[PDB]
């Protein structure tokens, strides 16, 4: 899954 948080 793409992790969208920095």
């Amino acid at each position, epitope marked *: 899954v*793409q*992790i969208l*948080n920095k």
Partner: antibody
Amino acid sequence: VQLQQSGAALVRPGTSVKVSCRASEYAFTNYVIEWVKQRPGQGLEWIGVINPGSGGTNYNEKFKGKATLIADKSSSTAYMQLSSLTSDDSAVYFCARSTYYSGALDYWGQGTSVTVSS
Amino acid sequence: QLVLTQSSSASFSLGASAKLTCTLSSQHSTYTIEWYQQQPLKPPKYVMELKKDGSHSTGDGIPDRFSGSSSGADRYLSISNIQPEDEAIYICGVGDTIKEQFVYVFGGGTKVTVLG
């Protein structure tokens, strides 16, 4: 909403440069700051990201040990140090704003032109 | 090996329908990407966010002739009624956390010439 970058810099080869990115009309610590190099013909090269609430940083592998990203909450200013410069470091460098929650670089500085020359 | 594939150049006739392809690496075929527009001596402009379903969120000052769509690993920027003003390098970008590190990757960009 603006990102105000420092002026054109002349750097001698084998020396370092520090360029600045000041947050204007938004909450500095509520967005990350990303740093981007203009490529020679077309396109962009990601350098890294500073989380100013965290002091946390990540870098493109290639820029590890080359770029250091700093954030000064007090002055709402992000800094990028680039070390031991050669002619390949002669480029326009941008800072860009991004949320903690989405990839978008939604606002960009005007750019800083770095000339590395003897 | 998060990689975005774009053709270096694209040509379109004035007034025509323009579609640019940005292809994700297969393992990242579901990822959301961003579209940027770059004209010379200007900073890049944020164009839109584009998810795997074709749903998109366009940035400020982007005209409505600009839209986005998807099919598998492919992410599309569509410009209906292409204008001289739309000549630019269009770059896609994509973010992820890999080996516990945030990374953003750019495609090589597509230089768009408007013909006629």
